[PDB]
Design a protein around this ligand. Structure first.
Ligand SMILES: Cc1ccc([C@H](CC(=O)O)NC(=O)c2ncnc3[nH]ccc23)cc1
Length: 167
C-alpha cells in the first residue's frame, strides 16, 4: 500500500492520473520523482522547468555541479540526484527529443531506467516539448517498465485521449 490517490489502473504496475506532477510531488513526497531531463540538465522549460521552479532553482544549482564533475548524460540515460522539497530523490531521465532529430528507439532505453526503482512518480517521456506522440510513449512505458509507475499527465484533454485509446 502506498500514498498515491485517484489513479486509473492501466496494468498490473502502471497507474495514470490527470495531475500537475509538481503538485502531486508536493502532496505525496514520493521516494522518486522522474524529471524529463536533457543531457545538460538545463531545466529551462517543460516538466523540468516546472520541477526546478518548484525547488526555487536548487535543482538547477545541484545539476550544474553534477555536469561540471561528470559531463553530460547520454540520450536514453539517467542520473539520481536530490528530490529537494518534492521527493527523496529525483531520477533525471533523458528521453529523445524529436524536435532535435533524436532516435525515437532510444525511448525504450530511457524507460528502462525506471526499472532500477521500485516505485516512481513520472511524466510520459519524450512527450510535450520533446515532440514524441504521447500515445506511443505510454505504449513503450507499459511494455518496458516492470516496477510500479504512477504517471501524471498535466493536460486533461491529453489524459482523456490516452485513457480512451489505451489498448
Ligand atoms: C519531455 C516532457 C515534457 C513535458 C511533459 C508534460 C506533458 C503533459 O503531461 O501534459 N508536461 C508537464 O508535466 C508540465 N509541463 C510544463 N509545465 C508544467 N507544470 C507542471 C507540470 C508541467 C512530458 C514530457
Amino acid at each position: 500500500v502506498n500514498s498515491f490517490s485517484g489513479y486509473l489502473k492501466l496494468t498490473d504496475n502502471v497507474y495514470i492520473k490527470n495531475a500537475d506532477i509538481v503538485e502531486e510531488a508536493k502532496k505525496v513526497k514520493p521516494t522518486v520523482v522522474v524529471n524529463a531531463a536533457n543531457v545538460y540538465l538545463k531545466h529551462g522549460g517543460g516538466v523540468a522547468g516546472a520541477l526546478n521552479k518548484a525547488t526555487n532553482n536548487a535543482m538547477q544549482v545541484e545539476s550544474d555541479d553534477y555536469i561540471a564533475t561528470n559531463g553530460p548524460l547520454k540520450v536514453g540515460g539517467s542520473c539520481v540526484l536530490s528530490g529537494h522539497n518534492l521527493a527523496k530523490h529525483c531520477l533525471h531521465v533523458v528521453g529523445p527529443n524529436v524536435n532535435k532529430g533524436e532516435d525515437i528507439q532510444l525511448l525504450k532505453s530511457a524507460y528502462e531506467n525506471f526499472n532500477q526503482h521500485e516505485v516512481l512518480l513520472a511524466p510520459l517521456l519524450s512527450a510535450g516539448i520533446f515532440g514524441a506522440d504521447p500515445i506511443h510513449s505510454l505504449r513503450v512505458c507499459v511494455d518496458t517498465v516492470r516496477t510500479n509507475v504512477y504517471l501524471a499527465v498535466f493536460d486533461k484533454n491529453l489524459y482523456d485521449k490516452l485513457v480512451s485509446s489505451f489498448l
